[PDB]
Amino acid sequence: GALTESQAALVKSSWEEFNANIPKHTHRFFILVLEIAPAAKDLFSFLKGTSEVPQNNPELQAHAGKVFKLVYEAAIQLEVTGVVVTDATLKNLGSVHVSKGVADAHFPVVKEAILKTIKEVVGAKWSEELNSAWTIAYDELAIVIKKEMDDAA
Ligand code: HEM
Ligand SMILES: O=C(O)c1cccnc1
């Protein structure tokens, strides 16, 4: 697909849709995560000692938002420029993932959790062309973070 002018137009449009509801889309996101992999719970400070995923924990929202922003930004960057640019941020990310005891087999957990979250976010407007466009953008960004973790470990 590549990211045509037509495909990027599709990712931007769908990200704008996600931001429109951070406490929902981010709590869903942690549930999709614990559905796919339960043990992941012990990883997160704000999830430990708890029995369910807190719905209004600011720490938790701030946390999940930041993750989706990072995947959008990556898609536009692909259409316009043709690539994903690795900065300070992407590298610090790689450090903290290792402190917290996170591995690569964890990544398809958080991907499916994000494609499923966006399919849920865009509903009937969903196209093969759009799925293809976020898939392309996650893959391309994960390729970069995994790359930095392996560097932070
Ligand atoms: C392209 C995919 C990913 C992106 C964009 C991303 C982004 C981030 C960011 C931005 C932070 C720090 C948040 C803060 O300062 O507020 C963080 C922390 C963390 N990440 Fe991820 N991440 C990704 C994949 C993963 C995966 C696959 C896992 C494993 C399940 C994971 C587990 C964690 C943990 C345990 C922390 C520490 C949270 C705490 O303070 O207790 N991440 N990540
Ligand atoms: O909340 C976090 O810090 C988080 C969630 C998913 C992936 N990475 C980090």
Curated annotation (Swiss-Prot):
The modification Phosphoserine is found at S45. GO terms for molecular function: heme binding; metal ion binding; oxygen binding; oxygen carrier activity. O2 binds at H63. GO terms for biological process: nodulation; response to nitrate. The keyword Zinc does not apply. The modification Nitrated tyrosine is found at Y138. PROSITE patterns: GLOBIN (PS01033), PLANT_GLOBIN (PS00208). Heme b binds at S45, K66, H97, K100. InterPro entries: Globin, Globin-like_sf, Globin/Proto, Leghaemoglobin-like, Leghaemoglobin_Fe_BS. It is found in: Cytoplasm, Cytosol; Nucleus. Induction: Repressed by nitrate in a dose-dependent manner. It comes from the Eukaryota. Leghemoglobin that reversibly binds oxygen O(2) through a pentacoordinated heme iron. In root nodules, facilitates the diffusion of oxygen to the bacteroids while preventing the bacterial nitrogenase from being inactivated by buffering dioxygen, nitric oxide and carbon monoxide, and promoting the formation of reactive oxygen species (ROS, e.g. H(2)O(2)). This role is essential for symbiotic nitrogen fixation (SNF). Belongs to the plant globin family. Monomer. This is Leghemoglobin-2. It comes from Lupinus luteus. The lineage of its organism: Eukaryota, Viridiplantae, Streptophyta, Embryophyta, Tracheophyta.
